[model samples]
Target chain A: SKDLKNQLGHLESELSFLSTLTGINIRNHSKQTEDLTSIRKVLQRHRLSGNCHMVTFQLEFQILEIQNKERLSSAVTDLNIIMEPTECSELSEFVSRAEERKDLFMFFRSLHFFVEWFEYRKRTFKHLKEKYPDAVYLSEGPSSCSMGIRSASRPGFELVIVWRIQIDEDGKVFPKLDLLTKVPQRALELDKNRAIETAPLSFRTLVGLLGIEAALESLIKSLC
Target chain B: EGLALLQEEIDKMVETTELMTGNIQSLKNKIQILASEVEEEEERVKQMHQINLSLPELSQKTLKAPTLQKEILALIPNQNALLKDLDILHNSSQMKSMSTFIEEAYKKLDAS
Candidate 1:
């Protein structure tokens, strides 16, 4: 009655179906926001128009930006705020960058990134469930501040994808991603080729420069 | 004259047969215990198979090392006469992980 053969046979099925796919897009919302602004003239008492110097009552002002999707029509972009022009050093510089934009296209392009990341992420999982009932989103540690997903039927048999979102000290945006496996790692051995491969996982392409959809496709193709 | 010699030889043969009977019975009991040990071990492996040990290495390790003991041997086996055979050959200085440091002289004796 030993069932060794019975169990090994079923495991192969689980392995084949457990292979899964995921898409990730991480966008920095705060930095991409843009708004309109201008220097203000104070109270009407003895204010010479455009003279620059006023009679003591004044405050530095800034126009900061935030994002709101449901409110804005497709044409409108980024949102607005007020702070001293030099108030939050980086924010002020961020505002100036927006001032220099030649077209609203780039601004609209950037806003779509954050909207898809936070909004579409949840929807993606929901849609994915429709496609594969076994699919489940992986949970990140509290501080991981990222999105994760795993599709598995058995312990030690899993396909994992994670997207780590980071905002550096100087405010550079960095998105790190991984495609991993929990199967007997030795089973997924990859030969050294033009594109580097690591056991249990591999980079879809040169990551930071790659698009989420493109990277996903490339990872699947390399899943050899 | 031949009758006296025949009676003396018959008496010697009877004493030698009586002396061998005790050893033969002991050997028979040992064989019975060993056969049952093999039988019960197969059953235990069959039972563990139901538990679905999740990996090949763990499955293989369990195959190599029997983690369960005594339950299969507890009943229907004559431990009373089989104690010498059922007794462990492992207490030969029982070092952890350094399992085979000492010569397994006891099993070799059982083997011979």
Candidate 2:
């Protein structure tokens, strides 16, 4: 039916736009990019079917998609305001109780990994402050944490190591380390040379297979 | 006999039309449910859009952190050739010391 086809067309475009909109917004929030991407992939899978029941289920997921965004947006916002230098009591307590019960692998519905990140970075930055008084520091966000240091002699660049700590739904964390100078924020990295970077795991294996680390030693030695 | 056969054909056509009408009506109902749900979702997307309108700029602004940096750096004296010192200091016992400090933070928690 013309009407049915039109409805589907309009819905398809709207859903696509919604995903794009959330992607950009969450990226700015410095969080939830993957969660949104995962949801989008799921929604795409649902799109393969055009049965009325399937379409209805898809609409239900659209609601879920927006609701998830709202919750994550709110969660990160709360974490942003709750940071007291190196401590957050709710998170601290949350972890301790779990740890005391010998459940170090506890799963959290919200951003516990982010709070854990702040404690690590705050003290790390403090150590940097004490050790090298001339370095620079940047904070990514609440639901996210990123800190990098550049030598005072360097022109606003974290020369060797740039890192990321991201946690997902099950509270699993993977640390990402970048040896290049392109900071996550593109503008800050304008002075550095550019290269293609892939998933850290792939790049990790790539570097190991090709002995990129030895080359890095040579390069860093040359710079010094 | 011809009249009776013609009547029988007309009755069958009416029965088929009745079934078709019911099917069309059910389709309309399904469409209505979907249409209303889509309408509700559209309104929500609009609301969510307005909320996130500022998010695109928030991280860029937050990360700049001029005031926090100033506060952190206020007491420390500026250095001229700290790069060599910086690299050496970071090279020796850097992230390992950090791992110990925050890794055991759960010990600080007396979560009641």
Candidate 3:
């Protein structure tokens, strides 16, 4: 009895930690039935939901019904996604796949990164604007797809950062930023080596070396 | 007649003792099973926490072309890991108590 109590205590703490990290909470827990066809079998149901940074989700599932190793195989997942954001096509598709495949963990994991990238995009864009109000301009708002920068000294030299949140075929989400450079014909002709023609490729290299913010800052300084 | 009644009482006591012994053994097995399950749940929690942390840092670390392609692709394994872990958690009967804790936690989070 003492060991059982201790184990339960440990479980409570671990579950709390997990809830804290993922922002997912569980509710409406109930045992519907008990050991009908086999030993240590029961119909346990609950609602698992979370309010993440930009997304809120609610899922209902009957889980953990039997303890037998044999029963563990092909465990029937009576899963229902009660609510999820409808705006993100990728997320909507991912949720569909997750539900069909009964991969609730993957759903939560990818959702965490998906929302985090949104926050990251907004923060980086806002910070860049604050730091370089004159040189930096948001083409379609801070949280939008592009950030534009103009050379204060040069009349026609400019750069645009097109940032997007991309989800892979496997439902893993990430942020992608590409630099597009615009130079006047005279500006391009002055550089005989065709630096303007290769700025996008070189920007990629610069990002690899200096990271996103640092590389953007370097490019801004070069515009002068 | 008195001697026979005393013998009957002794037999009933023996039967009761036998039932108590069987119940104790059954409880012991249940306890052991629960203990092992709790340990596994602990490991799962730790793993989830690590992945939640690693993915964001990985995103922050590399934002390039070929390198970014390689780094982001590395997340697939983590995704699969979550799928497998969640599948196991979903199927685990010993973790039925998890729902109670989850419910309690949700109330706290909801309140805040």
Model 2: colliding residue pairs? none
Q: Say which candidate scores most in TM-score.
A: 3
Write down the C-alpha DockQ for each prediction: 0.01, 0.01, 0.02
lDDT of 3 by residue, A80-102 (tens): 77555654477666656666777
Ranking by TM-score: 3, 1, 2
Best by lDDT: 3
- List runs of model 3 lying over 4 Å from the truth: A1-19, A25-46, A62-88, A151-157, A182-191, B1-112
lDDT of 1 by residue, A78-140 (tens): 333233453124335434454444233343344334323434344444343344434443242
lDDT values for all models: 0.38, 0.39, 0.64
Q: Which candidate, 1 or 3, would have the higher lDDT against the true structure? A: 3
Give the least accurate 10-residue stretch of model 2 chain B, judged by summed lDDT: B50-59
Residue A196 CA displacement from its true place in model 3, Å: 2.4
- lDDT for A4 in candidate 2 is 96
Question: For model 1, what is the alpha-carbon lDDT of residue B67?
Answer: 14
Q: What is the lDDT of residue A127 in candidate 1?
A: 43
Q: Just chain B of model 1: what TM-score? A: 0.28
Give the Å shift of residue A151 in candidate 2.
4.5
